[PDB]
Amino acid sequence: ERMIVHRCRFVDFTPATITSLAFSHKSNINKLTPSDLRLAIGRSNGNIEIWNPRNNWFQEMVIEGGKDRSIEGLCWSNVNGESLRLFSIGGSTVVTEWDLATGLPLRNYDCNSGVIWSISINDSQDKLSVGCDNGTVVLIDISGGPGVLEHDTILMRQEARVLTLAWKKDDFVIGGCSDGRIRIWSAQKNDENMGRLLHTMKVDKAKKESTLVWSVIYLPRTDQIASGDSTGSIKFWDFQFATLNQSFKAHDADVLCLTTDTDNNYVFSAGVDRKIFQFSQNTNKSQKNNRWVNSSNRLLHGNDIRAICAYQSKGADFLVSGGVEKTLVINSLTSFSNGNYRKMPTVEPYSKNVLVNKEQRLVVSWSESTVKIWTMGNYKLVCKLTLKDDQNISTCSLSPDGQVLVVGRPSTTKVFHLQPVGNKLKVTKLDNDLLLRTSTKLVKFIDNSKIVICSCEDDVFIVDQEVELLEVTSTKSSIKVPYINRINHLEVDQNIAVISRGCGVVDILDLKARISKPLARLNNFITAVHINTSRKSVVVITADNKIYEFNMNVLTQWSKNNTDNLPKEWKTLKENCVGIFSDIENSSRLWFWGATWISRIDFDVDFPINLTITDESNFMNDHFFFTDKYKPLLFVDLISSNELAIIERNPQKAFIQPKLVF
Amino acid sequence: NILSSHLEANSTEILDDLMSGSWTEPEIKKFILTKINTVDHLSKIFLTISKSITQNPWNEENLLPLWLKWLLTLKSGELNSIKDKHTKKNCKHLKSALRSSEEILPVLLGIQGRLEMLRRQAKLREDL
Amino acid sequence: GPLNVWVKWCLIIHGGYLVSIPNLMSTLSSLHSTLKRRSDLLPRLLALDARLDCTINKFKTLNYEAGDIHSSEPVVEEDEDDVEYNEELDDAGL
């Protein structure tokens, strides 16, 4: 037969709105991009993705939160010589610091006053401001080491809630509040006026509603505070004399987030009216007169912009923005109006939420804390498990023959026997307290009974017991970004597995002797791994979009000519291939897929010859077929020797900025 | 049946006037629509019916005008795009052959009023 | 509708008096103006009902090509017994 294709649009797995973008390292234009730069994206359903902007923005890790959890602000902290530290507020009274290894909170510091509305990090990163609902600004001593947080000082109180914070330096702390005012406190310890609010400024109020100052930044090249409020106006204030220099009436509704570049020649700003405005001071006359101009204005987002940030280095100068529509947008910093931009896909499934089983023609898919199963026929939803004893979900696998499902999150996992009772299923928990106590990242089913478990604390069990696993050399990037030496992937069928950690290490393991035989042999982050039983091979693909294969018991000649005979589609690819499998009718052809395309490479053929992180910066160290007509893509797989399963996505009020009518 | 005979004759290569005659033979409304729904392309049925309705814009048969109005109802996404060199003057001379009835509908309705008045007063004065 | 039955009978019966009157149009101007403005727009609503009826029977015949299909097409469902076997806290309970 020819390939018959099930273009499924059943799964309505929808992410949530980006509420906070942050960059791990600050800008430093005249030095190279550090190998430890990570962008962090906190959504509104409570998960924190961490992306690396090397070679078109791959996604390294994801830290999920559970039911009724959100995340409103998040800040990085990297004292030079120590590990990265990631703090985040939710809609609650605590700050939550996460250890990047496990993907769990390692500290929930309850701030001692009210519900936190904003968070900011000191310059030199030893103190932390949390601005709370009862008008307080609380200082948290951060420099005690990673994990230990102390209370320092509650600054002088006020009535209205402080909605945004910024620091001048180690010295002063600026805060925009919900009464339309902008206070300036002094956090300079061992002064006479420590903690008391030195100044108050009032923005031009709205006529028929209350005004809220939503975004405040400090501009260090000049000595100003930029501030966006809920009238749309953007004001620049001289810090000394605490007074306005110039006001622009830029947006039509609120200005939720605004940011600046390194040398403060530009200020970018955005809000609910979904345009991004650029205010420039680049002319020598502008710099000697201290006069910003409203330079430009772009309409790129669909609904809102709730978070904006900027990075600028020797081989990277981009501002990143995201909002109520769930996608990310990258623009250039010094070439905003002129240059190009890239709207990311709303999901790039580096961690999958859908898998199928060929027997019973069935497919399982898990959104937040519920799984669902349907069969092909049309299609019919046969069962679902809205387990609400759970709070957060993570990865899942089904037994071949479709008997037992296992769902698994970083706190526990749970296994359910299934029996098809006709037009429905019957699902029963089968108790195992070892599974109920273990942390699981990946479960991948050696047999109908045996599974292999990768724990969040780097343990590899075999249940239904222990694989010896050698240690990795801890270099500076491994001590800086503390999840690089963590097992991302493991793929197995028939007693032979292979694990993969993102330092460029991909290690096989025989399930019998439980010995490594390492084949690290790599240069950067590994996107996907699939084992070919034909050729006795492992197939790794890295973030640079190269396909390597190696043998087992280094790379084959097919790899050796394929890598540099690779097609132009792969050489101009933008979305990384997150899934590989092999064809079912032929044991040697392999069939892979990214988030916007589907390809298939042939095992023997070779074809003839004749807005990124682009610098000389290193990685994290110091017949051929191609289609894209199923581009909003979530997951693909096979069922039998002729058909294919292509499950994708399909689609909210927004600020109407109308197209010209004719 | 005879609709299939007319379909095969009009689809083979030739006999278009005889094809419209065989269409006028059985001449169902439902089969008239079905013969438009079945065929995928026409051999300038619009051209031959254009010249027929141009040479007789006043015929008592409703067959070819019924066929033209159902062709224009069901296939006019493609009659404006099949051909535009002879078809342009075709629709031009068809439109100028048919506009005169729009010019003289008021006088015919006037004469209909005349005659209804005359016949009703003649029925009225009927000599007891 | 109802009253012009009266006006056609007045012309038919009194067909001599108001042909012997010297200024017919000047004496019943309001009838002439009313009928002129009623019958002046007849080509316009001719074009209107041609264009309207064309689309009307166009969707009528296209929907009569499949008019029996929407009588048993709706096979929709709801939160069935999978929800009862789904509630894992209620599965520990009952």
Partner: peptide
């Protein structure tokens, strides 16, 4: 029948999406 022919001629004068699941094919 003249007003009928005239009405029809004048009519001639003034006369002058994605489902949730498909199944298709692609190249081998």
């Amino acid at each position: 029948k003249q007003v009928e022919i005239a009405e029809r001629n004048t009519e001639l004068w003034n006369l002058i999406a994605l489902p949730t699941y498909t199944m298709e094919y692609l190249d081998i």
